[PDB]
Structure 1
């Protein structure tokens, strides 16, 4: 169908505007936050499935998968977690006042390291360290597949998905990286960041690499 446009709660636009703009040095921390969110969403579907085994059947495999698309300057982080409905994408990523947004900003003002972000529960927004644009594509067992999109501006759009591959269940973060951050398209780099910050992760982390034959 057509897109629907929603306004960000005010503190979130302010937080995103901060992050997309500061010259902080340790930008690679965004990967840790996104893998951690992925692992959180897989924990949720697994716990859910204890009392409700059919919830896994839409995508039995539990994994996190990173797919550099160098030609489009895009990086994708996919999981087969619980996923989000339209209403969830709208509430959880935008319109509702995050608990810790404003607190995180106050901590940052006072010297805090940007890497604390995830302890304030707003780690998702670290992605604007390396992307100037994002699509969250998500399929919950309780809804169709939808695309949430934002460029750190004051509003985001949400659109029923008739353009991307079917996720059976879960979420893809599609990051449209900045020109100064194309290094995160590289295999060695990605591996190195994962080894340094996501050692204790219960799910396989897969890396999709494209190689010219012979």
Structure 2
């Protein structure tokens, strides 16, 4: 059974602006999600300094990108700190409020959409290329949970009995818009990664399917 929650209204507004914008450089979403992945990895590593056992649920520290062409899905995974049910609700449904409000004001004055992660709300840039997202997350402190949004005013959180087990960390599962399926292609994915992420401390793994 799902539970339904309301977004802070300013987040809803930002999602509306992003999902509908004709902004041309949609590729910036990948930089923002890799940056969030890298931050979540920094947290578990720093946390582990005083609690090394925290690492044991998933000792490999990575960012992993997995196109799933038949489902028109792109997944961005990290083995970072992960989020509890309460953290998914709070991180994704609430605390972005102040950053989103400041960002929308900047946008009104003519700020580039690419400034979004300087306002600390780069997560929502996924709506440039996707019309739906599932955030699947496993924290050492909770069960695995699925947070789901379609850019509307409400989101769901559901105990996860349907997805692969993450040892620890987070998968952003992006349901790509029909005109943004280039983000399923290995050459395109590599090209975007290479541009705006050379100083990532973690391996960035691309999962490719090849016919033998």
Give TM-score scaled by structure 2 length. 0.99
Root-mean-square deviation over aligned CA pairs: 0.7
Show CA shifts across 1:135-193 (max 9, x none): 00000000000000000001000000000000000000000000100000000001000
Question: Is contact 2:96-2:121 (8 Å) kept?
Answer: no
For residues 110-147 of structure 1, the C-alpha deviation after alignment (integer angstroms, 9 at most, x for no partner) is: 11000000000000000000000000000000000000
**Whole-Å Cα distance in 2 between the matches of residues 101 and 202 of structure 1?**
28
Provide the rounded CA distance (Å) in 1 between the counterparts of 2:129 and 2:178: 9
Give the ranges of 4+ consecutive aligned residues of structure 1 lying more than 6 Å apart after TM superposition.
none
SS of the residue aligned with 2:163? coil
Sort the Cα spacing of 1:97 and 1:73 in 2 relative to 1 into closer, same or farther, 3 A: closer
* Counterpart contact for 1:6–1:95, Cα < 8 Å: no
Q: Deviations over 1:1-46 (max 9, x none)?
A: x000000101000000000001000000000000000000000000
Structure 2 unaligned regions, length at least 5 = none
Unaligned runs of 5+ in 1: none
Q: Distance in 2 between matches of 1:185 and 1:205?
A: 16
Whole-Å Cα distance in 1 between the matches of residues 108 and 152 of structure 2? 21
Whether the aligned pair in 1 keeps the contact of 2:96 and 2:120 (CA below 8 Å) is: no
Shift of residue 212 of structure 1? 1.0
SS in 2 for 1:37: helix
Find the aligned partners of 2:67 and 2:85 in 1 and give their Cα distance. 26
CA shift at 1:52, angstroms?
Answer: 0.6
* Inter-partner Cα distance in structure 1 for 2:205 and 2:123: 20
2:37 matched residue in structure 1: 38
